[PDB]
Design a protein around this ligand. Structure first.
Ligand SMILES: Cc1ccc2c(c1)NC(=O)[C@]2(O)C(F)(F)F
Ligand SMILES: Cc1ccc2c(c1)NC(=O)[C@]2(O)C(F)(F)F
Lengths: 237, 300
């Protein structure tokens, strides 16, 4: 059934599983027309498909041409997501295919179930966790490849960089969710924390800076402060 | 006009014949039901006074044979039997009709209710849903499960309704996943009508039979089947116009007949609200929508 705080550590066992987040698939800017009506302009988006145990991220870039001439785009976007996830699964060797796919939004259940009818043994699950994957486009290198794309494209990343050399997947996911929650609550402040010190750089093959163990502790504390703050600045506490 | 005699009535029981019913007391001199209209299927059904658990009954058509009811004290129920010796059976029925020991099928002449609930129901199709080939009549009870419920356990005692499943490979063409799931016309018209049922008459017959088993026996799997067959039509953007008009009549008479006090368990809120107010056919069931709104506005 649904994934929640009670069955947290299942994410880090040895059964292959993927999270799928669709919140950045259909992205628009809203603007006024010369007549003073409102219109939208689509911009490129992405499906965020993540193995939480290994950090492998399958970033399927959704180019705005996929929406041309289509109606009911928010509904289409869920089905397009499920189509692309199903295509990804079929593209993997059998021993790499997931045993479970966890969707971050319940509205993805039926589209994904229908696209995966050929795979009756792959469980499609919702979750009660409020995961911050919508903030993936606040990671500069991910936003850059999405915005530069001129055609549909899949790009593979490891969202944990080399962290698993030193920490567990449980700790790695904890750090990722903390960083993304911070970026979601106050992007400018979070990015300042991450980059303020110019002596700590992002390797060309990495997404995040090359912090030492000690520096990650400071960073993580700064993010936990930011989130508690904004939670005051928001609710006045 | 045909007759279903009773050997005796040794246990107190409520007897139904189609939409009618009456109480028979323990050892009352009751010898059956006369004046049964020829041309329709019928159902004779039973609820014992001591154990309202298990409603049970028999679908039959008097054109197919001479049927009588005999109480079996070993199996503890009223059983339908067939007599192929015609001379012997008529001698008894007459003998009983003379002594006035039978209730008359009490059809009002104005009244087309039973025809309207069984218009497309045929014994031959009933006998394919309820498999017991040695008999010309079909037993159904409250507890019998459907082939689909068994997939999700005795197969001989099952209701073999046509399986409908909206999230199944049969319902969804590869490459039309979104199209086929949001508009079920393919599944209705090609898979089910052209492929399985052959025509809409057979589809409506199974739908009507499922409703009647849900209403008369409280058979839960039959209720599921009835709602699935409604939803499959209402969720299709492309439906023959004659089918929509007939479905409106079918459902109108079903809703009209439903006991007011059973609406809570026999009507699925989600399906009816979806069908009447959201589906492609939301504006195509005028008679059904009007009776539902005036009789069961709570459900909506
Ligand atoms: C699994 C797990 C437990 C506890 C936490 C995380 C992840 N991430 C966090 O920042 C934290 O909230 C905290 F504050 F305790 F560190
Ligand atoms: C009405 C009625 C009652 C009972 C019977 C028939 C018809 N036909 C039968 O063979 C019999 O079972 C029997 F044995 F008693 F004659």
């Amino acid at each position: 059934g649904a994934m929640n705080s009670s069955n947290y550590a299942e994410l880090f066992n040895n059964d292959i599983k993927l999270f799928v987040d669709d919140t950045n698939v259909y992205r628009v800017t809203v603007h006024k027309t010369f007549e003073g009506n409102v219109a939208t302009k689509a911009i490129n988006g992405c499906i965020f498909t993540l193995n939480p145990k290994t950090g492998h991220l399958f970033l399927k870039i959704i180019h705005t041409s996929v929406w041309a001439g289509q109606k009911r785009l928010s509904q289409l976007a869920k089905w397009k997501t499920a189509e692309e996830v199903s295509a990804l699964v079929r593209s993997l060797p059998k021993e790499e295919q997931p045993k479970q796919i966890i969707v971050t939004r319940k509205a993805m259940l039926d589209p994904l179930e229908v696209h995966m009818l050929d795979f009756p043994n792959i469980a499609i699950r919702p979750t009660e966790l409020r995961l911050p994957f919508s903030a993936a486009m606040s990671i500069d290198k991910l936003s850059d490849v999405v915005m530069k794309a001129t055609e549909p494209q899949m790009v593979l990343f490891n969202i944990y960089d080399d962290w698993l050399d030193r920490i567990s997947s449980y700790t790695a996911f904890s750090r990722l969710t903390l960083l993304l929650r911070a970026l979601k609550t106050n992007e400018e402040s979070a990015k300042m924390i991450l980059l303020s010190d110019p002596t700590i750089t992002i390797k060309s093959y990495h997404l995040w800076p090359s912090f030492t163990d000690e520096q990650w502790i400071t960073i993580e504390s700064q993010m936990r402060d930011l989130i508690l703050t904004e939670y005051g600045r928001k609710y006045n506490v | 006009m045909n007759t279903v005699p009773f050997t005796s009535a040794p246990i107190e029981v409520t007897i139904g014949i189609d939409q009618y019913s009456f109480n028979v007391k323990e050892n009352q001199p009751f010898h059956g039901i006369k004046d049964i209209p020829i041309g329709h299927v019928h159902v004779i059904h039973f609820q014992h006074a001591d154990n309202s658990s298990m409603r049970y009954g028999y679908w039959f058509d008097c054109r197919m044979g001479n049927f009588y009811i005999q109480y079996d004290p070993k199996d503890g129920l009223y059983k339908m039997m067939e007599e192929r010796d015609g001379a012997k059976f008529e001698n008894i029925v007459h003998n009983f009709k003379e002594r006035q020991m039978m209730v008359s099928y009490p059809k009002i002449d104005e009244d087309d209710t039973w025809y309207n609930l069984t218009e497309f129901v045929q014994m031959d199709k009933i006998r394919k849903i309820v498999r017991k080939d040695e008999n010309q009549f079909s037993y159904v009870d409250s507890s019998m499960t459907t082939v689909q419920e068994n997939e999700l356990s005795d197969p001989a005692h099952s209701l073999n309704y046509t399986v409908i499943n909206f999230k199944s490979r049969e319902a969804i063409r590869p490459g039309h996943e979104m199209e086929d799931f949001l508009d079920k016309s393919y599944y209705l018209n090609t898979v089910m009508l052209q492929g399985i049922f052959k025509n809409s008459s057979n589809y409506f017959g199974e739908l009507q039979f499922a409703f009647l088993n849900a209403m008369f026996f409280g058979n839960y799997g039959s209720s599921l089947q009835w709602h699935a067959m409604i939803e499959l039509i209402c969720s299709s953007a492309t439906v023959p116009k004659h089918m929509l008009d007939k479905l409106d009549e079918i459902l109108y008479y079903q809703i009209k007949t439903l006991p007011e006090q059973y609406s809570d368990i026999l009507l699925n809120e989600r399906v009816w609200n979806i069908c009447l107010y959201s589906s492609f056919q939301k504006n195509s069931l005028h008679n059904t929508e009007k009776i539902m709104e005036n009789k069961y506005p709570e459900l909506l």
